[PDB]
Amino acid sequence: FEATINKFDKNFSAHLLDLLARLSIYSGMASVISR
Amino acid sequence: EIITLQLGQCGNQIGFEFWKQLCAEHGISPEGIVEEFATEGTDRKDVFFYQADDEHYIPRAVLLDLEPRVIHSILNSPYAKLYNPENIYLSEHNNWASGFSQGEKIHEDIFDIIDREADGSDSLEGFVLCHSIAGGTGSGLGSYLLERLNDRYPKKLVQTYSVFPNQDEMDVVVQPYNSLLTLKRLTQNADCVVLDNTALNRIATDSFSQINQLVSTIMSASTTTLRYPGYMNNDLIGLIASLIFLMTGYTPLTTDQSVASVRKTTVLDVMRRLLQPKNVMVSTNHCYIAILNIIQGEVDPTQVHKSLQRIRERKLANFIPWGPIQVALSRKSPYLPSAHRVSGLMMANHTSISSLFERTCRQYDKLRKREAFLEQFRKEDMFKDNFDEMDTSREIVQQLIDEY
Amino acid sequence: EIITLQLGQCGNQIGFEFWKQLCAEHGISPEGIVEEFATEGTDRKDVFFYQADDEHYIPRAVLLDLEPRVIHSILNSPYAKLYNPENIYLSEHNNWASGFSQGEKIHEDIFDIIDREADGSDSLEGFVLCHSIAGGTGSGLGSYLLERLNDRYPKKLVQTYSVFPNQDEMDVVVQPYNSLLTLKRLTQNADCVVLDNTALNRIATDSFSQINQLVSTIMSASTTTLRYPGYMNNDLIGLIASLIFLMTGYTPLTTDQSVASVRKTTVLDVMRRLLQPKNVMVSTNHCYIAILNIIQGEVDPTQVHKSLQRIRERKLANFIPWGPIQVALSRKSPYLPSAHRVSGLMMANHTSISSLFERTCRQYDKLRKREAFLEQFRKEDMFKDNFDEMDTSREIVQQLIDEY
Amino acid sequence: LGQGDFIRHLMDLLKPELVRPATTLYQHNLTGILETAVRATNAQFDSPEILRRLDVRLLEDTGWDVFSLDYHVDGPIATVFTRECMSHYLRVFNFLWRAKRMEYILTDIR
């Protein structure tokens, strides 16, 4: 348990930096980053 | 649904004016009747009231007190008939130990009343407590009730509006003991709104009737969205999760005579005003932990986003370095005049609150070294043998300060 | 947008009559209501006013004063309700050192007000200051505010209408010190309108109400084009760049009784009149640095070109030998009667203004050699130890005179 | 540019954008800025019909070389402009845009 919580952090934070990445490349869809 | 437990003169009044504000908002007549214009109302009433076969609505409130005078005056008010005589309780006949001893003595009837009220609600969500931590009644009785409640109901929230003693003003000579013990109990059992007379009256300036009118305003604005269902934040637990000790501030704290300056009030200016230490109703690069802003009236989420962006860029706030606010919107009651184009209430968790306890600890340590006013405490059974309770409470508060 | 900071009795009044003129021009009711005939107005109002949810308009003004009497009288005027009570500030309870000491003392609330006002404008452009340099209040308070403002806001313009003490008339016995220090601060922090009672009253002849009515006329005519957008000169920075100490003159400075002589007023005759030393409202082959003429009413650019050509040929003016004017046109407000077929206002920079300081320096040097009226100054902290401040200020003014 | 009040605010908002090269410029972003200017300045009090036609176009460097307004017109009114007045106004609008940024530069230096 003490060793798997830190795994989720490295796993979940990796997907979030992917969501904020693709949501930036656009011409709304740009105001989501400010949310 | 929810229950309100108000103790001591402070709590008794707090409840009086809180229910005054509620009945004003929901269009509830003083006698419990409903006005004709509000017959088709859409507002949810179950949260704080339950209707009766006579069509009248009864608050989910219980009155507790060591003395009769305050409640007797309450029952002479125009709002007297509204309350439930069954729930109200008065002691037949200023110390924390005495208060807790009585609480041990009068367990049965109090919990009878509480159980009766609880069984009348399908989806009770938590508890609300209003009391003062200095006086003998509020401190000890709230301590006892919190202990036995957290024991009895391990699946209900416990929210309190605790009033803290003035410090710049030298009121309870034995305040340090009661405050320290009540804080022990709050940390050890309370789920989640600090209050102090000093800064409250400071903002009021710059009778208890007006002070507690402001306090009731704070409480009602806190519970608005729960009362008025919307899309988000449709439950108290949603509130608590989004933040978790607290402090509060309300922008449109304006007298009935101060409406002459109808200032064009955006959302940005309000949410900004909620940040300043002046508006924080309570009195090491201390920083925030959480901020929530509930906004009433017309609101454009574009304006909210712009205000958030600008405040973030202007860095008017400071946050924890080790962890990554919230702006919720509600609707005003359709009845009270909308003298304010848009209004704002803020509840936040900020580390600076630690100072409070450091003062009280300093106060308490400033007495325990000389054994001042311990004679009465030794009288009660709890402090009959020793005062290890006091030492444990002090160390618990010290641990909390260290944690902050 | 813009903010106005008016200090001392002089500044307080100046502001009163300036806002009177503004509300007259824009068709703003005394209470802040808008007249029916002006409902569809095209004039821009954001520059000096911001509207309110109650449809009323509030000036972007702040009232400062060491004494209550003047502002108390203001709030008894028919225009009282217009101002914002929040912004107005009055000291709860005649020297520059005392003024600066108080400014150090009351930093927090003043800058609170200023920040609140600033955050309500998207495109604030600069600051406007109205004050007198002789009296204790205006001089010291303006000094402190200018210092802390140039420190706080390094990207905003700072414009002032500084009133200089009469000299032919022997009013402030300690005027040399306050004037010299205020000039130090103006050179060291002020972005950019000199004013003197002597020549102002001279032209008035050939109560403070009428004098400051004329001054407010000057200010409003200066800000007209900004208020009324056109093609060119659509910003204060455009004004400043086209010139950069200043002096001013206005042609149609005619009493309400002196309209009987409806003189056929071309543009040529006006622009000519703006050149004479008589019309310059302030009192070595000294020459010009810059000239700007803003013209109101019907205007044919052919007439303007012809007037410029003829004046250039007639060489009525003198220019710097080491460097290579401007005539801008605006539109009158659609409301005030156009008693003048065409009107003209002139703002210029001319080297002769140096003489002013040479007088004051001569005044100051005429006292520092004998240590007159320094007892009060030693009382304040700033001049508690020494008066090196005074020496630095004097040398700075001397450097400015040498530069001219 | 006969308005002056509107073009002033419009040159203050396009400053952070046009400084970048044209490759990173996309039309869908500037329209929100133009719409913001028409709302803030005095051009808001205006006929909604004519405001429906006023938009942006991207000429085809730097952002100060490919920006220009269009004001397309179709229908019966298009028989007065005839695709040649719209090919002449844009030929003029460049000279009034350059002589307008060469001035707001020189009032920034000042």
- SS3 (DSSP) at C181: helix
Alpha-carbon C81 to chain mean position: 25
Are C58 and B264 inside 8 Å of each other by CB?
yes
For strands C326-330 and B326-330, give the pairing. unpaired
C-alpha–C-alpha distance, residues C326 and C304, integer Å? 11
CA angle C195, C198, C204 (to 5 degrees): 90
Residue of B187, B188, B81, B70 lying closest to B138 (CA atoms): B70
The answer for residues whose C-beta is within 8 angstroms of residue B348's C-beta and 6 or more apart is B243, B246, B247, B248, B249, B280, B288, B289, B290, B291, B292
Nearest CA in chain A to B309: A34
C-alpha–C-alpha distance, residues C255 and C248, integer Å? 19
- Show the tokens assigned to B129: 């407590």
Chains near A with 3+ CB pairs less than 8 A apart are B, D
Are C53 and B341 inside 8 Å of each other by CB?
yes
C-alpha–C-alpha distance, residues B274 and B278, integer Å? 9
User: Distance (Å) from the C-alpha of residue A34 to the closest C-alpha of chain B?
Assistant: 7
| B126 belongs to an annotated ligand binding site | no
Residues 109-128 of C with CB under 8 A from D: 122-123
Q: Which residue has tokens 């109101």? A: C296
C-alpha–C-alpha distance, residues C352 and C194, integer Å? 12
Sheet holding B247-250: strands in order across? B247-250, B342-350, B288-297, B326-330
DSSP notation for C262-328: -----HHHHHHHTTSTTTSS------EEEEEEEEEE---HHHHHHHHHHHHHHT-S---TT---EEE
Distances (CA, A) of C278 to C202, C281, C316, D54: 9, 7, 14, 51
Q: Which amino acid is at C160?
A: T
Among D29, D31, D56, the strongest candidate for a mutation testing the A interface, having the largest count of A CBs within 10 A, is D29
CB atoms within 10 A of CB A4: 9
Nearest CA in chain B to C51: B264
Using an 8 Å CB-CB cutoff, list chain A residues near D26: 27
Residues 166-225 of C with CB under 8 A from D: none
User: Distance (Å) from the C-alpha of residue B309 to the closest C-alpha of chain A?
Assistant: 7
Residue of B165, B207, B194 lying closest to B364 (CA atoms): B165
C-alpha–C-alpha distance, residues B98 and B238, integer Å? 37
Q: Is C42 on the interface with D (CB under 8 A)?
A: yes
Q: Residue C57 forms beta bridges with which residues?
A: C51
Q: Which residue has tokens 């539109």? A: C331
Is-contact B348 B291, C-beta < 8 A?
A: yes
Alpha-carbon A35 to chain mean position: 13
With 0-12 CB in 10 A as exposed, 13-18 as middle and 19+ as buried, what is C251?
buried
Nearest CA in chain B to A28: B302
C-alpha–C-alpha distance, residues C221 and C249, integer Å? 10
Nearest CA in chain B to A32: B305
Q: Quick one: which H or E segment has residue B247?
A: strand B247-250
Residue of C149, C97, C21, C114 lying closest to C374 (CA atoms): C97
Among A24, A25, A26, A27, the strongest candidate for a mutation testing the D interface, having the largest count of D CBs within 10 A, is A27
Are D40 and C237 inside 8 Å of each other by CB?
no
R_g over Cα of chain C: 21
**What resolution in angstroms does the PDB record give?**
7.7
User: Distance (Å) from the C-alpha of residue B151 to the closest C-alpha of chain A?
Assistant: 29
User: Distance (Å) from the C-alpha of residue C41 to the closest C-alpha of chain D?
Assistant: 10
C-alpha–C-alpha distance, residues B194 and B192, integer Å? 10
Are C53 and B260 inside 8 Å of each other by CB?
no
Q: Which residue has tokens 């050699």? A: C369
Q: Is D65 on the interface with C (CB under 8 A)?
A: no
**How many residues are present in chain A?**
35
Residue of C62, C17, C6 lying closest to C208 (CA atoms): C17
DSSP notation for D56-105: EEE----TTSSEEE-----STTHHHHTTTSHHHHHHHHHHHHHHHHHHHT
Tell me how far apart the 2 most distant CA atoms of chain C are, in Å: 65
Chains near D with 3+ CB pairs less than 8 A apart are A, C
Q: Which residue has tokens 């046109």? A: C329
C-alpha–C-alpha distance, residues B385 and C153, integer Å? 65
User: Distance (Å) from the C-alpha of residue C140 to the closest C-alpha of chain D?
Assistant: 29
Helix C175-189 / helix C388-403 crossing angle, nearest 10 deg: 60
| B99 belongs to an annotated ligand binding site | no
Residues of D in CB contact (< 8 Å) with A are 26-29
Among B205, B255, B263, the strongest candidate for a mutation testing the C interface, having the largest count of C CBs within 10 A, is B263
C-alpha–C-alpha distance, residues B138 and B9, integer Å? 8
- Show the tokens assigned to C143: 């000094």
Residue of D32, D27, D21 lying closest to D10 (CA atoms): D32
| B138 belongs to an annotated ligand binding site | yes
Are C231 and D2 inside 8 Å of each other by CB?
yes
**How many residues are present in chain C?**
404
Are C53 and B272 inside 8 Å of each other by CB?
no
- Show the tokens assigned to C323: 């460097």
C-alpha–C-alpha distance, residues C87 and C81, integer Å? 13
C-alpha–C-alpha distance, residues B29 and B335, integer Å? 13
DSSP notation for B113-135: HHHHHHHT-SS--EEEEEEESSS
C-alpha–C-alpha distance, residues B107 and B102, integer Å? 8
Say which of D9, D12, D42 has its CB closest to residue C42.
D42
Q: Which residues of C sit in the known binding site for GTP?
A: 134-140
Using an 8 Å CB-CB cutoff, list chain C residues near B272: 119
The answer for residues whose C-beta is within 8 angstroms of residue B274's C-beta and 6 or more apart is B249, B251, B293, B344, B345, B346
Are C53 and B261 inside 8 Å of each other by CB?
no
Q: Quick one: which H or E segment has residue A17?
A: helix A5-22
Are C230 and D42 inside 8 Å of each other by CB?
no
Say which of C234, C240, C241 has its CB closest to residue D4.
C234
Q: Residue B34 forms beta bridges with which residues?
A: B28
Is-contact B146 B183, C-beta < 8 A?
A: no
Using an 8 Å CB-CB cutoff, list chain A residues near B305: 31, 34-35
Residues 16-35 of A with CB under 8 A from B: 31, 34-35
C-alpha–C-alpha distance, residues C310 and C291, integer Å? 16
